[PDB]
Ligand binder design. Structure first.
Ligand code: ATP
Ligand code: KVR
Length: 337
Protein backbone atom coordinates (compact mmCIF):
# COMPACT_ATOMS: atom_id res chain seq x y z
CA UNK A 1 0.00 0.00 0.00
CA UNK A 2 2.90 2.37 0.71
CA UNK A 3 3.90 2.22 -2.96
CA UNK A 4 2.98 5.22 -5.12
CA UNK A 5 2.33 4.67 -8.81
CA UNK A 6 4.31 6.54 -11.49
CA UNK A 7 2.26 8.50 -14.03
CA UNK A 8 3.39 6.30 -16.92
CA UNK A 9 2.06 3.31 -15.02
CA UNK A 10 -1.11 5.30 -14.33
CA UNK A 11 -1.32 5.95 -18.05
CA UNK A 12 -0.74 2.43 -18.62
CA UNK A 13 -2.97 0.65 -16.10
CA UNK A 14 -6.39 1.62 -17.48
CA UNK A 15 -5.41 0.24 -20.88
CA UNK A 16 -3.96 -2.77 -19.05
CA UNK A 17 -7.21 -3.35 -17.15
CA UNK A 18 -9.36 -3.11 -20.26
CA UNK A 19 -7.00 -5.24 -22.37
CA UNK A 20 -6.95 -8.01 -19.76
CA UNK A 21 -10.74 -7.73 -19.41
CA UNK A 22 -11.17 -8.59 -23.08
CA UNK A 23 -8.32 -11.10 -22.66
CA UNK A 24 -10.53 -12.73 -19.95
CA UNK A 25 -13.68 -12.72 -22.15
CA UNK A 26 -11.78 -14.15 -25.13
CA UNK A 27 -10.29 -16.90 -22.94
CA UNK A 28 -13.90 -17.54 -21.82
CA UNK A 29 -15.34 -17.81 -25.37
CA UNK A 30 -12.40 -19.86 -26.64
CA UNK A 31 -12.94 -22.43 -23.89
CA UNK A 32 -16.62 -22.41 -24.87
CA UNK A 33 -18.36 -20.04 -22.46
CA UNK A 34 -21.78 -18.71 -23.43
CA UNK A 35 -23.83 -15.66 -22.49
CA UNK A 36 -26.82 -16.01 -20.19
CA UNK A 37 -29.24 -13.93 -18.11
CA UNK A 38 -28.73 -15.97 -14.95
CA UNK A 39 -25.79 -16.37 -12.55
CA UNK A 40 -25.14 -20.05 -13.27
CA UNK A 41 -21.68 -21.35 -14.15
CA UNK A 42 -22.76 -25.01 -14.33
CA UNK A 43 -25.60 -24.18 -16.75
CA UNK A 44 -23.19 -22.03 -18.83
CA UNK A 45 -25.06 -18.72 -18.43
CA UNK A 46 -23.62 -15.41 -17.18
CA UNK A 47 -24.07 -11.72 -18.25
CA UNK A 48 -20.27 -11.32 -17.67
CA UNK A 49 -19.44 -12.04 -21.39
CA UNK A 50 -20.70 -8.60 -22.57
CA UNK A 51 -18.47 -5.52 -22.52
CA UNK A 52 -17.30 -4.08 -19.21
CA UNK A 53 -19.98 -1.38 -19.44
CA UNK A 54 -22.80 -3.94 -19.49
CA UNK A 55 -20.73 -6.22 -17.25
CA UNK A 56 -21.43 -5.85 -13.51
CA UNK A 57 -19.58 -2.71 -12.38
CA UNK A 58 -18.56 -4.59 -9.18
CA UNK A 59 -16.53 -7.05 -11.33
CA UNK A 60 -15.26 -4.23 -13.62
CA UNK A 61 -13.99 -2.20 -10.61
CA UNK A 62 -12.73 -5.47 -9.05
CA UNK A 63 -10.66 -6.04 -12.23
CA UNK A 64 -9.15 -2.52 -11.94
CA UNK A 65 -8.29 -3.12 -8.25
CA UNK A 66 -7.05 -6.61 -9.20
CA UNK A 67 -4.64 -4.98 -11.65
CA UNK A 68 -3.76 -2.27 -9.20
CA UNK A 69 -2.59 -4.89 -6.70
CA UNK A 70 -0.63 -6.55 -9.51
CA UNK A 71 1.17 -3.31 -10.40
CA UNK A 72 1.92 -2.59 -6.75
CA UNK A 73 3.21 -6.17 -6.51
CA UNK A 74 5.63 -5.84 -9.42
CA UNK A 75 6.83 -2.67 -7.72
CA UNK A 76 7.15 -4.34 -4.30
CA UNK A 77 8.99 -7.35 -5.77
CA UNK A 78 12.02 -5.11 -6.32
CA UNK A 79 11.48 -5.40 -10.08
CA UNK A 80 12.31 -1.99 -11.52
CA UNK A 81 10.76 -1.06 -14.87
CA UNK A 82 12.05 0.84 -17.88
CA UNK A 83 10.28 2.56 -20.77
CA UNK A 84 11.40 1.09 -24.10
CA UNK A 85 9.59 3.37 -26.55
CA UNK A 86 6.31 5.06 -27.40
CA UNK A 87 5.59 4.24 -31.06
CA UNK A 88 5.21 0.51 -30.41
CA UNK A 89 2.55 1.42 -27.84
CA UNK A 90 0.86 3.85 -30.24
CA UNK A 91 0.74 1.22 -33.00
CA UNK A 92 -0.29 -2.29 -31.92
CA UNK A 93 -1.25 -4.83 -34.57
CA UNK A 94 -4.30 -7.09 -34.32
CA UNK A 95 -4.42 -10.76 -35.30
CA UNK A 96 -7.21 -11.99 -37.52
CA UNK A 97 -9.49 -14.22 -35.48
CA UNK A 98 -11.93 -17.01 -36.41
CA UNK A 99 -15.68 -16.51 -36.14
CA UNK A 100 -16.14 -19.33 -33.61
CA UNK A 101 -13.46 -17.76 -31.41
CA UNK A 102 -15.21 -14.41 -31.95
CA UNK A 103 -18.13 -13.35 -29.78
CA UNK A 104 -21.30 -11.73 -31.11
CA UNK A 105 -19.49 -8.44 -31.70
CA UNK A 106 -17.06 -8.39 -34.61
CA UNK A 107 -14.38 -6.62 -32.57
CA UNK A 108 -11.22 -8.70 -32.23
CA UNK A 109 -9.69 -7.99 -28.80
CA UNK A 110 -6.51 -10.09 -29.13
CA UNK A 111 -3.70 -7.51 -29.44
CA UNK A 112 -0.23 -8.00 -30.94
CA UNK A 113 0.48 -11.65 -30.18
CA UNK A 114 2.96 -12.13 -27.35
CA UNK A 115 4.71 -15.08 -29.04
CA UNK A 116 7.45 -12.77 -30.33
CA UNK A 117 8.30 -11.80 -26.75
CA UNK A 118 10.30 -14.48 -24.96
CA UNK A 119 10.23 -15.11 -21.21
CA UNK A 120 13.65 -15.06 -19.56
CA UNK A 121 14.26 -17.28 -16.51
CA UNK A 122 14.06 -14.18 -14.31
CA UNK A 123 10.80 -13.17 -15.99
CA UNK A 124 9.42 -16.64 -15.26
CA UNK A 125 10.62 -16.40 -11.65
CA UNK A 126 8.74 -13.15 -11.14
CA UNK A 127 5.68 -14.74 -12.76
CA UNK A 128 5.96 -17.43 -10.09
CA UNK A 129 6.26 -14.81 -7.34
CA UNK A 130 3.21 -12.89 -8.62
CA UNK A 131 1.28 -16.17 -8.67
CA UNK A 132 2.39 -16.83 -5.08
CA UNK A 133 1.32 -13.35 -3.97
CA UNK A 134 -2.07 -13.65 -5.67
CA UNK A 135 -2.67 -17.03 -4.03
CA UNK A 136 -1.69 -15.57 -0.65
CA UNK A 137 -4.05 -12.62 -1.13
CA UNK A 138 -6.65 -15.18 -2.25
CA UNK A 139 -6.28 -17.06 1.05
CA UNK A 140 -6.12 -14.02 3.29
CA UNK A 141 -9.56 -13.20 1.92
CA UNK A 142 -10.84 -16.75 2.60
CA UNK A 143 -9.40 -16.72 6.18
CA UNK A 144 -10.98 -13.29 6.77
CA UNK A 145 -14.22 -14.93 5.57
CA UNK A 146 -13.46 -17.70 8.09
CA UNK A 147 -13.15 -20.42 5.44
CA UNK A 148 -10.64 -23.06 6.70
CA UNK A 149 -8.80 -25.90 4.92
CA UNK A 150 -10.51 -29.25 4.45
CA UNK A 151 -9.71 -32.45 2.56
CA UNK A 152 -13.10 -32.08 0.85
CA UNK A 153 -14.77 -28.74 -0.04
CA UNK A 154 -17.71 -27.85 2.26
CA UNK A 155 -20.07 -25.05 1.11
CA UNK A 156 -21.68 -24.70 4.56
CA UNK A 157 -18.76 -25.44 6.87
CA UNK A 158 -16.58 -23.15 4.70
CA UNK A 159 -13.85 -25.73 4.10
CA UNK A 160 -11.82 -25.43 0.86
CA UNK A 161 -9.12 -28.02 0.03
CA UNK A 162 -7.78 -25.02 -1.96
CA UNK A 163 -6.38 -23.19 1.11
CA UNK A 164 -2.87 -24.70 0.93
CA UNK A 165 0.59 -23.25 0.16
CA UNK A 166 1.14 -22.68 -3.54
CA UNK A 167 3.76 -25.43 -3.72
CA UNK A 168 1.19 -27.91 -2.38
CA UNK A 169 -1.56 -26.48 -4.60
CA UNK A 170 -3.31 -28.67 -7.16
CA UNK A 171 -1.65 -28.61 -10.57
CA UNK A 172 -4.86 -27.68 -12.46
CA UNK A 173 -5.70 -24.35 -10.77
CA UNK A 174 -2.02 -23.55 -10.17
CA UNK A 175 -1.52 -23.69 -13.96
CA UNK A 176 -4.74 -21.69 -14.61
CA UNK A 177 -3.62 -18.83 -12.33
CA UNK A 178 -0.08 -19.17 -13.72
CA UNK A 179 -1.25 -18.71 -17.33
CA UNK A 180 -3.22 -15.52 -16.53
CA UNK A 181 -0.17 -14.29 -14.56
CA UNK A 182 2.21 -15.19 -17.41
CA UNK A 183 -0.02 -13.54 -20.01
CA UNK A 184 -0.40 -10.53 -17.71
CA UNK A 185 3.38 -10.12 -17.37
CA UNK A 186 3.83 -10.60 -21.12
CA UNK A 187 1.18 -7.94 -21.78
CA UNK A 188 3.05 -5.57 -19.45
CA UNK A 189 6.24 -6.25 -21.42
CA UNK A 190 4.42 -5.79 -24.73
CA UNK A 191 3.26 -2.38 -23.56
CA UNK A 192 6.88 -1.38 -24.10
CA UNK A 193 7.30 -1.00 -20.33
CA UNK A 194 10.23 -3.40 -20.15
CA UNK A 195 10.86 -4.71 -16.65
CA UNK A 196 14.36 -5.47 -15.37
CA UNK A 197 14.60 -8.08 -12.64
CA UNK A 198 16.28 -7.48 -9.28
CA UNK A 199 19.61 -9.25 -8.94
CA UNK A 200 19.53 -12.90 -7.92
CA UNK A 201 19.85 -13.04 -4.13
CA UNK A 202 21.35 -16.25 -2.72
CA UNK A 203 20.01 -17.09 0.73
CA UNK A 204 21.08 -20.25 2.56
CA UNK A 205 19.38 -21.08 5.85
CA UNK A 206 22.05 -23.68 6.79
CA UNK A 207 19.23 -25.70 8.41
CA UNK A 208 18.93 -23.49 11.48
CA UNK A 209 15.44 -24.86 12.10
CA UNK A 210 15.77 -27.99 14.22
CA UNK A 211 14.09 -29.96 16.98
CA UNK A 212 14.01 -27.48 19.87
CA UNK A 213 17.55 -26.09 19.71
CA UNK A 214 19.69 -29.19 19.24
CA UNK A 215 22.21 -28.86 16.41
CA UNK A 216 23.51 -32.44 16.43
CA UNK A 217 23.08 -35.79 18.19
CA UNK A 218 26.00 -38.02 19.19
CA UNK A 219 25.75 -41.82 19.15
CA UNK A 220 28.46 -43.89 20.83
CA UNK A 221 29.05 -47.30 22.34
CA UNK A 222 29.15 -47.87 26.09
CA UNK A 223 32.27 -46.74 27.95
CA UNK A 224 32.96 -50.31 29.11
CA UNK A 225 33.80 -51.38 25.54
CA UNK A 226 36.87 -49.12 25.39
CA UNK A 227 39.76 -50.66 23.44
CA UNK A 228 43.32 -50.15 24.68
CA UNK A 229 45.24 -52.37 22.24
CA UNK A 230 44.79 -54.34 19.03
CA UNK A 231 43.35 -53.69 15.59
CA UNK A 232 39.70 -52.67 15.37
CA UNK A 233 37.27 -51.90 12.55
CA UNK A 234 33.68 -50.70 12.24
CA UNK A 235 31.56 -49.27 9.44
CA UNK A 236 29.32 -46.21 9.18
CA UNK A 237 26.69 -45.97 6.45
CA UNK A 238 25.50 -42.59 5.16
CA UNK A 239 21.84 -42.71 4.18
CA UNK A 240 22.02 -38.97 3.45
CA UNK A 241 24.92 -36.67 2.59
CA UNK A 242 25.02 -33.87 5.15
CA UNK A 243 26.77 -32.74 8.32
CA UNK A 244 28.05 -35.99 9.81
CA UNK A 245 31.12 -37.09 11.75
CA UNK A 246 32.39 -40.58 12.52
CA UNK A 247 35.45 -41.77 14.41
CA UNK A 248 36.74 -42.84 17.81
CA UNK A 249 36.03 -41.08 21.10
CA UNK A 250 37.34 -41.18 24.65
CA UNK A 251 34.94 -42.00 27.53
CA UNK A 252 35.23 -38.39 28.67
CA UNK A 253 33.45 -37.00 25.62
CA UNK A 254 30.77 -34.37 26.22
CA UNK A 255 27.47 -35.06 24.39
CA UNK A 256 26.82 -31.32 23.93
CA UNK A 257 30.12 -30.45 22.21
CA UNK A 258 30.84 -31.04 18.54
CA UNK A 259 32.97 -34.03 17.60
CA UNK A 260 36.66 -33.20 17.16
CA UNK A 261 36.44 -29.63 18.44
CA UNK A 262 38.18 -30.74 21.65
CA UNK A 263 40.83 -33.38 22.42
CA UNK A 264 38.38 -36.05 23.58
CA UNK A 265 37.40 -37.25 20.09
CA UNK A 266 38.84 -37.98 16.66
CA UNK A 267 36.36 -37.61 13.81
CA UNK A 268 36.13 -37.33 10.02
CA UNK A 269 33.80 -34.76 8.45
CA UNK A 270 33.40 -35.86 4.85
CA UNK A 271 30.76 -33.19 4.25
CA UNK A 272 33.59 -30.63 4.31
CA UNK A 273 36.35 -33.23 3.76
CA UNK A 274 37.75 -32.29 7.18
CA UNK A 275 39.51 -34.28 9.88
CA UNK A 276 38.62 -33.05 13.36
CA UNK A 277 40.83 -33.16 16.45
CA UNK A 278 41.22 -29.80 18.23
CA UNK A 279 40.71 -28.20 14.83
CA UNK A 280 39.92 -28.99 11.21
CA UNK A 281 42.41 -29.92 8.49
CA UNK A 282 41.72 -30.97 4.92
CA UNK A 283 41.61 -34.75 4.58
CA UNK A 284 39.98 -37.06 2.07
CA UNK A 285 37.05 -36.37 -0.23
CA UNK A 286 33.31 -35.95 0.24
CA UNK A 287 30.77 -38.77 0.36
CA UNK A 288 27.41 -39.12 -1.35
CA UNK A 289 24.22 -40.85 -0.26
CA UNK A 290 24.76 -44.55 0.34
CA UNK A 291 28.52 -44.29 0.85
CA UNK A 292 30.00 -46.57 3.52
CA UNK A 293 32.82 -45.22 5.69
CA UNK A 294 35.19 -47.67 7.37
CA UNK A 295 37.06 -46.66 10.52
CA UNK A 296 40.23 -48.51 11.56
CA UNK A 297 42.36 -47.92 14.66
CA UNK A 298 45.49 -49.77 15.73
CA UNK A 299 46.54 -48.85 19.27
CA UNK A 300 49.88 -50.64 18.85
CA UNK A 301 51.55 -47.93 16.73
CA UNK A 302 48.91 -45.30 17.63
CA UNK A 303 47.57 -44.70 14.11
CA UNK A 304 44.12 -44.02 12.69
CA UNK A 305 42.84 -44.55 9.14
CA UNK A 306 39.62 -44.14 7.16
CA UNK A 307 38.06 -45.67 4.04
CA UNK A 308 35.37 -44.26 1.75
CA UNK A 309 33.61 -47.10 -0.11
CA UNK A 310 36.81 -49.14 0.23
CA UNK A 311 39.53 -46.81 -1.04
CA UNK A 312 41.93 -45.33 1.50
CA UNK A 313 41.33 -41.65 2.21
CA UNK A 314 44.48 -39.53 2.14
CA UNK A 315 45.41 -36.20 3.70
CA UNK A 316 46.97 -33.41 1.64
CA UNK A 317 50.19 -35.43 1.58
CA UNK A 318 50.48 -39.04 0.48
CA UNK A 319 50.14 -40.41 4.01
CA UNK A 320 47.26 -42.78 4.70
CA UNK A 321 47.13 -41.92 8.43
CA UNK A 322 44.41 -39.48 9.48
CA UNK A 323 45.99 -39.07 12.94
CA UNK A 324 49.63 -40.13 12.98
CA UNK A 325 50.21 -40.25 16.75
CA UNK A 326 48.11 -40.08 19.91
CA UNK A 327 48.07 -41.48 23.44
CA UNK A 328 46.31 -44.64 24.61
CA UNK A 329 44.94 -42.93 27.72
CA UNK A 330 41.68 -44.50 28.86
CA UNK A 331 40.82 -46.09 25.49
CA UNK A 332 38.58 -45.44 22.51
CA UNK A 333 35.00 -46.29 21.53
CA UNK A 334 33.13 -45.81 18.23
CA UNK A 335 31.33 -42.47 17.95
CA UNK A 336 29.11 -40.71 15.43
CA UNK A 337 27.53 -37.26 15.19
N1 ATP B 1 -13.12 -8.82 -11.68
C1 ATP B 1 -12.34 -9.53 -10.88
N2 ATP B 1 -11.14 -9.02 -10.50
C2 ATP B 1 -10.37 -9.75 -9.69
N3 ATP B 1 -10.59 -10.95 -9.17
C3 ATP B 1 -11.78 -11.43 -9.56
C4 ATP B 1 -12.69 -10.80 -10.38
N4 ATP B 1 -13.81 -11.60 -10.55
C5 ATP B 1 -13.56 -12.68 -9.84
N5 ATP B 1 -12.34 -12.63 -9.21
C6 ATP B 1 -11.75 -13.65 -8.36
O1 ATP B 1 -12.66 -14.72 -8.26
C7 ATP B 1 -12.41 -15.46 -7.04
C8 ATP B 1 -13.72 -15.88 -6.43
O2 ATP B 1 -13.68 -17.30 -6.12
P1 ATP B 1 -12.58 -17.84 -5.09
O3 ATP B 1 -11.42 -18.40 -5.84
O4 ATP B 1 -12.31 -16.80 -4.05
O5 ATP B 1 -13.36 -19.06 -4.39
P2 ATP B 1 -13.41 -19.61 -2.89
O6 ATP B 1 -12.02 -19.72 -2.37
O7 ATP B 1 -14.31 -20.80 -2.85
O8 ATP B 1 -14.14 -18.40 -2.14
P3 ATP B 1 -14.98 -18.30 -0.77
O9 ATP B 1 -14.09 -18.87 0.31
O10 ATP B 1 -15.27 -16.84 -0.57
O11 ATP B 1 -16.23 -19.12 -0.98
C9 ATP B 1 -11.52 -14.56 -6.17
O12 ATP B 1 -10.22 -15.11 -6.03
C10 ATP B 1 -11.48 -13.22 -6.92
O13 ATP B 1 -10.22 -12.59 -6.79
C1 KVR C 1 -8.48 -12.29 -11.49
O1 KVR C 1 -8.80 -10.99 -11.97
C2 KVR C 1 -9.77 -10.82 -12.92
C3 KVR C 1 -9.81 -9.58 -13.54
C4 KVR C 1 -10.75 -9.31 -14.51
C5 KVR C 1 -11.70 -10.27 -14.86
C6 KVR C 1 -11.67 -11.54 -14.24
C7 KVR C 1 -10.71 -11.79 -13.27
C8 KVR C 1 -12.66 -12.61 -14.61
N1 KVR C 1 -13.97 -12.38 -13.99
C9 KVR C 1 -14.89 -13.52 -14.20
C10 KVR C 1 -14.82 -14.50 -13.05
C11 KVR C 1 -15.59 -14.31 -11.91
C12 KVR C 1 -15.52 -15.19 -10.86
C13 KVR C 1 -14.68 -16.29 -10.91
C14 KVR C 1 -14.60 -17.25 -9.77
O2 KVR C 1 -15.67 -17.66 -9.27
O3 KVR C 1 -13.47 -17.60 -9.37
C15 KVR C 1 -13.90 -16.48 -12.04
C16 KVR C 1 -13.97 -15.59 -13.10
C17 KVR C 1 -14.54 -11.05 -14.21
C18 KVR C 1 -14.46 -10.58 -15.65
S1 KVR C 1 -12.87 -9.86 -16.12
Amino acid sequence: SQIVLPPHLERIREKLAENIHELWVMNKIELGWQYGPVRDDNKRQHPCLVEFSKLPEQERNYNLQMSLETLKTLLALGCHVGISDEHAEDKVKKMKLPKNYQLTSGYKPAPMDLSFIKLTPSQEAMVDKLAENAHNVWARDRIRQGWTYGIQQDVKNRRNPRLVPYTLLDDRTKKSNKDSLREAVRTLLGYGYNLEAPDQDHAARAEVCSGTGERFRIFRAEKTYAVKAGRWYFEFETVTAGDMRVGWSRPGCQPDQELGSDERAFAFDGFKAQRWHQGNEHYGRSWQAGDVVGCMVDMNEHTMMFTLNGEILLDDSGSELAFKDFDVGDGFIPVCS
